[PDB]
Design an enzyme around this catalytic site. Structure first.
Site, short mmCIF file in Angstrom:
data_model
loop_
_atom_site.label_atom_id
_atom_site.label_comp_id
_atom_site.label_asym_id
_atom_site.label_seq_id
_atom_site.Cartn_x
_atom_site.Cartn_y
_atom_site.Cartn_z
N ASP A 99 0.78 -0.89 0.30
CA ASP A 99 0.13 -0.29 0.03
C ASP A 99 0.99 0.98 0.05
O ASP A 99 0.49 2.18 -0.99
CB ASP A 99 -0.59 -0.02 1.43
CG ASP A 99 0.00 -0.06 2.61
OD1 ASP A 99 1.01 -0.40 2.74
OD2 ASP A 99 -1.11 -0.56 4.29
N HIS A 100 2.19 1.22 0.02
CA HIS A 100 3.34 2.05 0.28
C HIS A 100 3.19 3.04 -1.06
O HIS A 100 4.23 3.79 -0.62
CB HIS A 100 3.92 2.12 2.17
CG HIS A 100 3.73 2.30 2.98
ND1 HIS A 100 2.50 2.00 3.45
CD2 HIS A 100 4.16 3.48 3.36
CE1 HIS A 100 2.13 2.37 4.42
NE2 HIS A 100 2.96 3.37 4.67
N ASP A 164 3.98 -0.39 11.50
CA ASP A 164 3.00 0.79 10.91
C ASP A 164 2.84 1.17 12.74
O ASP A 164 1.83 0.83 13.52
CB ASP A 164 2.88 0.94 10.03
CG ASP A 164 1.57 1.76 9.31
OD1 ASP A 164 0.40 2.93 10.30
OD2 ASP A 164 1.95 2.45 8.73
N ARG A 446 -1.32 12.65 10.48
CA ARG A 446 0.05 13.83 10.27
C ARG A 446 -0.35 14.45 9.83
O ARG A 446 -0.52 14.57 8.50
CB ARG A 446 0.36 12.66 9.94
CG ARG A 446 1.05 11.87 11.05
CD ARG A 446 2.26 10.90 10.93
NE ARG A 446 2.00 9.73 12.42
CZ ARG A 446 2.52 9.01 12.41
NH1 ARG A 446 2.94 8.21 11.28
NH2 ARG A 446 2.33 8.01 13.89
N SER A 641 5.93 8.09 13.34
CA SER A 641 6.10 6.94 12.48
C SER A 641 6.65 5.78 12.89
O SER A 641 8.73 6.36 13.60
CB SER A 641 6.96 7.21 10.54
OG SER A 641 7.46 6.32 9.43
N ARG A 643 9.67 3.46 11.57
CA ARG A 643 10.43 3.28 10.48
C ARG A 643 11.54 3.56 11.27
O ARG A 643 12.19 4.05 11.83
CB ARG A 643 11.38 4.30 9.41
CG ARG A 643 10.75 5.97 9.79
CD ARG A 643 10.55 6.60 8.79
NE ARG A 643 9.47 6.71 8.81
CZ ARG A 643 9.43 8.10 8.34
NH1 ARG A 643 9.99 9.21 7.83
NH2 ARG A 643 7.62 8.24 7.61
S1 SF4 Z 1 -2.10 6.00 8.39
FE1 SF4 Z 1 -0.51 5.25 7.57
S2 SF4 Z 1 -1.09 3.29 6.53
FE2 SF4 Z 1 -2.44 4.93 7.01
S3 SF4 Z 1 -3.52 5.78 4.73
FE3 SF4 Z 1 -1.79 7.22 6.11
S4 SF4 Z 1 0.36 6.20 5.45
FE4 SF4 Z 1 -0.69 4.93 5.13
#
Ligand code: SF4
Length: 753
Positions: A99-100, A164, A446, A641, A643
């Protein structure tokens, strides 16, 4: 007991509420006090409930998670470390979600086709490592990790870990879902106990019920403003009270999701009839029926104690919008137009973006379509650009079928692939130049500097999807959907009615196209191929074991001023390309942090050449010449995040310790995991005793011990020395990670060679 499977894809893996009950009962006979809901689920998953030391905020719990979930920007490094462990198969149900890496440019199908071509090496690596180690694989286009988990994997009472930081989303179905770095996921995939510092518990009692424009997003926009981004650190947020039955299950997931922005370990809601209804509509009536039989263990005990209580009256709560450069700067929508004007924030909204896992449910799309059909009924379309990210393929197929996608297209919206896209900066944004000041509003979570489009002067405000739609139609922040008037095509002024929509489809969900790939748990003879000349993937070489000596005359690479998120330490956007390649991604190390010496980003003094230059290049010069270095930071270092790249990159470029006023939880764990020393000032005023030119000696590593501080000798250039003390939160397990060079090295030592 019952033999009810954990999901439709794992027909053999049964839910173990019997185990959960048995453990809750061993523990409450020891504590002889009421347990909160998060205590019941967390202590019900202890590896050893009879002997575990349990003290909130103080002991490290050894836990047994039920399943592991990974998204493709963090799965690559978690799998490269699993491949170094040498273990043949994962020990618990585990999934990868792609998804990223799908960039928003052309919309939906076109962007997915492009992503599949551009990212073929990586999707190939993940699918192949998945088939070999027994990890289920959700293909590109399938959906965003947390929406697939709510729809298929989360259930009341699960302990789930995900690589995540928005894994807490799953708290909306009564489970404890916790964000970790890739190396923690390797522990659990390897079958060894996972450790978590025993959380404090903040209770939030909800009273009343939501009305009109106020939506579930407003509860957590309000809570973030109250608690602030560092207010939830070391605690689980546990929602309770009569107002809970007023919120849909996906609404509860929205509130649990954004509790990541106050630093909370996770958030959870008690099992109730809204969850039961969602489980039945997502094919899991047998799990709702089993949870009804174990219901006492899925709600809090009467009279349980919260370390902090907050009360929110849902009936008085009104729409909020937060930002612009932090998620805890909260404003009612009603006053943001006036605050913007005062602060010099652009009033005109260039882009309105709905969706992401935080707000892409069927109810969220229905409510946004309900606002959009009114504007359409007066001949209007969006004045701002408008994008829509469906959270999964099932939600894209169902809102398409029930007609909400066509309303959103008719008001001028573009439907993007079912992926993070603009939420982590995978957006080819061309309408503003870099450095151009402008305003976008999102239903994301965010809204930190340069995260949606790498432009530091984009002012991003987060709110609910129905408010993003109302403001996209108006094109300005100086519009309050509850009071103000729009003018139709026809000349008449009209006011937007508050959106009403079904929370779940009346018919069933349309599952959309086939996107899951089960591992052959037969066959498994795959060869994972990482080309030695790949620019995107690189096998790991183990880090050096500790030399047995103290750390003397350490150079300061950079003393950071103020906020330093993991997007400042290891930026996303364009760097996502290198998430499986440690040497290449280490070229973004700390390029966003502000240097206290000159208040610039990416400009530090090389101590040898006396030239100011890029932080990556300076760290590689110090490593090349044998100079060991340190980072000095401020409060809540590593915010954001999960990471683990933010910890692996300083280790790789020769860093030894990060000394700050405080750490966010996941980054501090990731640093310990990779063999670095996260240390905090025993007196935070000591941050002002250290100047960029000072050298540091950390002493006492030889008798490094839980609870004992380390001494740090600050060596000033003029010959003055000052000794200060540094605290750390290492227990004995973690000191072994440090002595071995990393947790992975320690694990490979325990495999008898
Ligand atoms: S919060 Fe994280 S997992 Fe959810 S859509 Fe945004 S970047 Fe993707």
């Amino acid at each position: 007991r019952a033999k009810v499977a954990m999901s439709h894809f794992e027909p053999h893996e049964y839910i173990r509420y019997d185990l959960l009950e048995k453990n809750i009962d061993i523990v409450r006979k020891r504590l002889n006090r009421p347990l909160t809901l998060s205590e019941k689920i967390v202590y019900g998953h202890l590896d050893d409930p009879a002997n575990q030391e349990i003290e909130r905020g103080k002991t490290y719990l050894r836990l047994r998670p039920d399943r592991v979930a990974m998204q493709d920007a963090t799965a690559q490094m978690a799998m490269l470390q699993f491949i170094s462990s040498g273990l043949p198969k994962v020990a618990v149900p585990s999934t990868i979600h792609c998804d990223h890496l799908i960039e928003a440019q052309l919309g939906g199908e076109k962007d997915l086709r492009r992503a599949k071509d551009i990212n073929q090496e990586v999707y190939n690596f993940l699918a192949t490592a998945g088939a070999k180690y027994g990890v289920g694989f959700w293909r590109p286009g399938s959906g965003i990790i947390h929406q697939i988990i709510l729809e298929n994997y989360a259930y009341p009472g699960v302990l789930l870990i995900g690589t995540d930081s928005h894994t807490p989303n799953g708290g909306g179905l009564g489970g404890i879902c916790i964000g970790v770095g890739g190396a923690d996921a390797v522990d659990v995939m390897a079958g060894i106990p996972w450790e978590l510092k025993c959380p404090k518990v903040i209770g939030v009692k909800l009273t009343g019920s939501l009305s009109g424009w106020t939506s579930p997003k407003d509860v957590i926009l309000k809570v973030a403003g109250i608690l602030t981004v560092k207010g939830g650190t070391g605690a689980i947020v546990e929602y309770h009270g009569p107002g809970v039955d007023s919120i849909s299950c996906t609404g509860m997931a929205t509130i649990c999701n954004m509790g990541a922005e106050i630093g909370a370990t996770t958030s959870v809601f008690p099992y109730n009839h809204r969850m039961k209804k969602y489980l039945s509509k997502t094919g899991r009536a047998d799990i709702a029926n089993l949870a009804d039989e174990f219901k006492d263990h899925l709600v809090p005990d009467s009279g349980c104690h919260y370390d902090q209580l907050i009360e929110i009256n849902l009936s008085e709560l009104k729409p909020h919008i937060n930002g612009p450069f932090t998620p805890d700067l909260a404003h009612p929508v009603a006053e943001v137009g006036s605050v913007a004007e005062k602060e010099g924030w652009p009033l005109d909204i260039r882009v309105g973006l709905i969706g992401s896992c935080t707000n892409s449910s069927y109810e969220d799309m229905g409510r946004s379509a309900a606002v959009a059909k009114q504007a359409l009924a007066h001949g209007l379309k969006c004045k701002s650009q408008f994008t829509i990210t469906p959270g999964s393929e099932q939600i894209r197929a169902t809102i398409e079928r029930d007609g909400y996608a066509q309303v959103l297209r008719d008001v001028g919206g573009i439907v993007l692939a079912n992926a993070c896209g603009p939420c982590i900066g995978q957006w080819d944004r061309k309408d503003i130049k870099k450095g151009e000041k402008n305003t976008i509003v999102t239903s994301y979570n965010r809204n930190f500097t340069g995260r949606n489009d790498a432009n530091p002067e984009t002012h991003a405000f987060v709110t609910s999807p129905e408010i993003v739609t109302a403001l996209a139609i108006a094109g300005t922040l100086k519009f309050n959907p509850e009071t103000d008037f729009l003018t139709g095509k026809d000349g008449k002024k009209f006011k937007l009615e508050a959106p009403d929509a079904d929370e779940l489809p009346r018919a069933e969900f349309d599952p959309g196209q086939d996107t899951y790939q089960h591992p052959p748990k037969d066959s498994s003879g795959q060869r994972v191929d990482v080309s030695p000349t790949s620019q995107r993937l690189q096998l790991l070489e183990p880090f050096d074991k500790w030399d047995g000596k103290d750390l003397e005359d350490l150079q300061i690479l950079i003393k950071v001023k103020g906020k330093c998120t993991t997007d400042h330490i290891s930026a996303a956007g364009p760097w996502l390309k290198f998430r499986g390649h440690l040497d290449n991604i280490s070229n973004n190390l700390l390029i966003g942090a502000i240097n206290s010496e000159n208040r610039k980003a990416n400009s530090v003094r090389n101590a040898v050449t006396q030239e100011f230059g890029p932080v990556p290049d300076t760290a590689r010069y110090y490593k090349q010449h044998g100079i060991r270095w340190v980072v000095i930071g401020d409060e809540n270092y590593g915010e954001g995040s999960s990471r683990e790249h933010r910890a692996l990159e300083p280790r790789f470029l020769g860093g030894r310790a990060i000394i700050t006023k405080s750490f966010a939880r996941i980054h501090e764990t990731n640093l310990k995991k990779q063999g670095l020393l996260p240390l905090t000032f025993a007196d935070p005023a000591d941050y002002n005793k250290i100047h960029p030119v000072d050298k540091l000696t950390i002493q006492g590593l030889k008798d490094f011990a839980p609870g004992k501080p380390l001494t740090c000798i600050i060596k000033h250039p003029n010959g003055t020395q000052e000794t200060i003390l540094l605290n750390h939160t290492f227990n004995e397990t973690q000191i072994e990670w440090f002595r071995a060079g990393s947790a992975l090295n320690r694990m490979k030592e325990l495999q008898q060679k």
